[PDB]
């Protein structure tokens, strides 16, 4: 229940990569789509226009996919799929799947507390 | 088990052979460092003798009435001072051969007619002159990298010389510095070993890079002042 991670998580960018022009229009969702225009100052990358994602914004390989818990998550649907985290609880974190009953969540969380597996949903639905 | 006892037998055999190998290399390194000490000793000695000897002949010629004419520099340090944009293609090929493929690279060149008339073609793009002993030694230490297996190795120890060179009787960093500075028989190999030095941008600034040094700029011969410049490119 104590993290194995010994390497501070630094992120090169926290703000999202919203679609350019999602602000002016309502029909345009926030999910990034690369501007393919020929005069698109976003694509031509003028300073002052919504930044595109590169690979350069990647995060460190050993500090990738860790929640602030400093555990990598893993979604479990039931106690059987939970008991496979005994020998990882210092690097993996079990989350109960979003469509389980609370009767089965009580069992998952009961079992997890004893197997000593960190969970982020032991106060979900109760 | 026969399998595992056999495996350990071979493991012990290789473990014995590594031990004896390392003892042999300890003895070899112990004698090799004395050899290097001797070489560096007599390089310092002969540098000093050449420097004093030049003065001696110059006074001797003056007292005899005429004058002595110093024997021109055998070696040039050439550093590129223009970006890679809007270059004439001939110039691009000449710089790919002089190995100046990125702004502020600095390479060591023999002076011969082919090379100096190849510099005359890209002169507005280069700044070059005659490095002195401090220049050569501190470039090769502080910014010394080796073209080993096409890979670039930071010559932070004497070992890397032993692989890149040594077929050419260069064992140490001082052997390499000498054999460059007093342009030697194996200077082709001891220079194609080196990687094109990556320099800093010139601290204290620069003058205009558009004019020749004679007109006020930076390109072309500054014959000795490449000395006063490397201290600021480094």
């Amino acid at each position: 229940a104590v993290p194995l991670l010994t390497r501070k998580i630094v992120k090169k960018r926290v703000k999202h990569f919203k679609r350019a022009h999602s602000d002016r229009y309502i029909g345009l969702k926030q999910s990034w789509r690369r501007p393919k225009g020929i005069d698109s100052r976003v694509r031509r990358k003028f300073k002052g226009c919504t930044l595109m994602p590169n690979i350069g914004y990647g995060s460190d390989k050993k500090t990738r996919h860790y929640l602030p818990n400093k555990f990598k998550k893993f979604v479990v649907h039931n106690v059987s799929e939970l008991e496979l985290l005994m020998m990882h609880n210092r690097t993996y974190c079990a989350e109960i799947a979003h469509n389980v009953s609370t009767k089965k969540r009580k069992d998952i969380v009961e079992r997890a507390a004893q197997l000593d597996i960190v969970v982020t949903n032991k106060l979900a639905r109760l | 088990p026969e399998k595992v006892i056999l495996k350990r037998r071979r493991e012990e055999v290789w473990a014995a052979e590594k031990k004896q190998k390392v003892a042999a290399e300890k003895i070899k390194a112990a004698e090799n460092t004395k050899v290097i000490y001797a070489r560096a000793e007599q390089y310092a000695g002969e540098y000093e003798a050449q420097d004093k000897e030049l003065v001696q002949l110059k006074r001797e010629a003056r007292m005899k009435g005429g004058f002595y004419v110093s024997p021109e520099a055998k070696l040039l340090f050439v550093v590129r001072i223009r970006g890679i944009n809007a270059m004439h293609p001939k110039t691009k090929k000449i710089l790919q051969l002089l190995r100046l493929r990125q702004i502020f690279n600095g390479v060591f060149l023999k002076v011969n007619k082919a090379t100096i008339n190849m510099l005359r073609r890209v002169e507005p793009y280069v700044a070059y002159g005659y490095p002195n002993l401090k220049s050569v030694r501190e470039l090769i230490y502080k910014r010394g990298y080796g073209k080993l297996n096409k890979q670039r190795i930071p010559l932070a120890n004497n070992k890397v010389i032993e692989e890149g060179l040594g077929k050419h009787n260069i064992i140490c960093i001082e052997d390499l510095v000498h054999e460059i500075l007093t342009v030697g028989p194996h200077f082709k190999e001891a220079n194609n070993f080196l990687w094109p030095f990556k320099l800093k941008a010139p601290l204290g600034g620069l003058k205009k890079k558009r004019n020749h040094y004679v007109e006020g700029g930076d390109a072309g011969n500054r014959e000795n002042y490449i000395n006063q410049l490397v201290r600021r490119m480094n």
């Binding site: 789509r33 690369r34 393919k36 020929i38 | -």
Partner: protein, 144 residues
């Protein structure tokens, strides 16, 4: 297999892979072989020499049966001989092979023969085939 088709990868790229400047209109070169002698001329006379013109004399009502002459080289004949009737033989006795029983009419002569005599029995033969068989010591029987 739609999931591999490269158009699915060109989704979102305005031109769908046929260019902005010169577009993808219907038939900018004509329907098919059009302009054989006019503008596809370079094509037809570079990659298909001999397309245009009449050569040779007509043959009304050609039946491919009348042009039917399956061949076998001499080199294939000993495969036609089963091992046990290869062994039932000596220096002077040779197996008699009727190629028509195998479906061949002519016996051409490409390849080697062993020293072993062989008596081929065919509907046609060439020069070289008989020369090779005689030189192997075997003979020829003509049948039909």
């Amino acid at each position: 297999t739609t999931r591999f088709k490269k158009n699915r990868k060109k989704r979102g790229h305005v031109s769908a892979g046929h260019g902005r400047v010169g577009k993808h209109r219907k038939h900018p070169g004509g329907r098919g072989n059009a302009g054989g002698m006019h503008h596809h001329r370079i094509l037809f006379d570079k990659y298909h020499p001999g397309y245009f013109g009449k050569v040779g004399m007509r043959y009304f009502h050609k039946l491919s049966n009348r042009f039917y002459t399956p061949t076998v080289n001499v080199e294939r004949l000993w495969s036609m001989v089963p091992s046990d009737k290869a062994a039932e033989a000596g220096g002077d006795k040779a197996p008699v092979v009727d190629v028509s029983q195998f479906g061949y009419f002519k016996v051409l002569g490409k390849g080697m023969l062993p020293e072993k005599p062989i008596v081929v029995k065919a509907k046609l033969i060439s020069k070289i085939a008989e020369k090779k068989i005689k030189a192997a010591g075997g003979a020829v029987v003509l049948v039909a």
